[PDB]
């Protein structure tokens, strides 16, 4: 879904998350995000990176850890 929001115009997501356009700066927008705190909000680039490293960390062979322990 694509939408257009003028300056203090907000968006309602579920019951709810609410996105409030708080400023246009103008190479950037200062968004505001209200949500319950069982739900976290992150910059996408940060969240993707941590996804990536989680996946990268899920392939440790038993041989690898034996060698790594030794050297430790």
């Amino acid at each position: 879904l694509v939408l257009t929001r003028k300056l203090k115009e907000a968006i309602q997501i579920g019951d709810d998350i609410e996105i409030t356009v708080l400023a246009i700066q103008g190479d950037q927008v200062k968004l505001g995000i209200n949500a319950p705190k069982h739900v976290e909000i992150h910059r996408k680039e940060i969240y993707l990176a941590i996804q990536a490293e989680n996946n990268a960390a899920s392939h440790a062979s038993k041989s690898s850890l034996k060698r790594l322990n030794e050297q430790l």
């Binding site: 940060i46 941590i50 990536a52 490293e53 989680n54 960390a57 440790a60 850890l65 060698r67 790594l68």
Partner: protein, 140 residues
Amino acid sequence: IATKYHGDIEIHEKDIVRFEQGIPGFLEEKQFVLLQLEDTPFIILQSVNTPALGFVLIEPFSYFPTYEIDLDDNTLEQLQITGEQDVALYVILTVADPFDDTTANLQAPIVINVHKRLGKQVILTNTNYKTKHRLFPEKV
């Protein structure tokens, strides 16, 4: 449950740590048990529902003395902690090729409360911690 490193074991349900959110990249993995690999400092965050999924954890402190961390009150209560007594703190290792580029994810430790059996990967906000911190100094 079959496991990744420990062969077949079974467990009692008060062993099981619940990750309601799972962790980024494995959102539906919501049950884990923590298993030391003898005779190593490695803690294996092992999936109760996926035998082949096991993450390698280390207590951050032995290798990063300086490592200190502030739990956003959000985190403080999706884990539902009452104070210190709870809680356990770990980092995910990325064992690399070769071994001496092994890194720890300090920006996103695994936080558990050993009494209520609740788990979460906490994305540390407002910090200079990286997603890859080397265990070893890089020689040459």
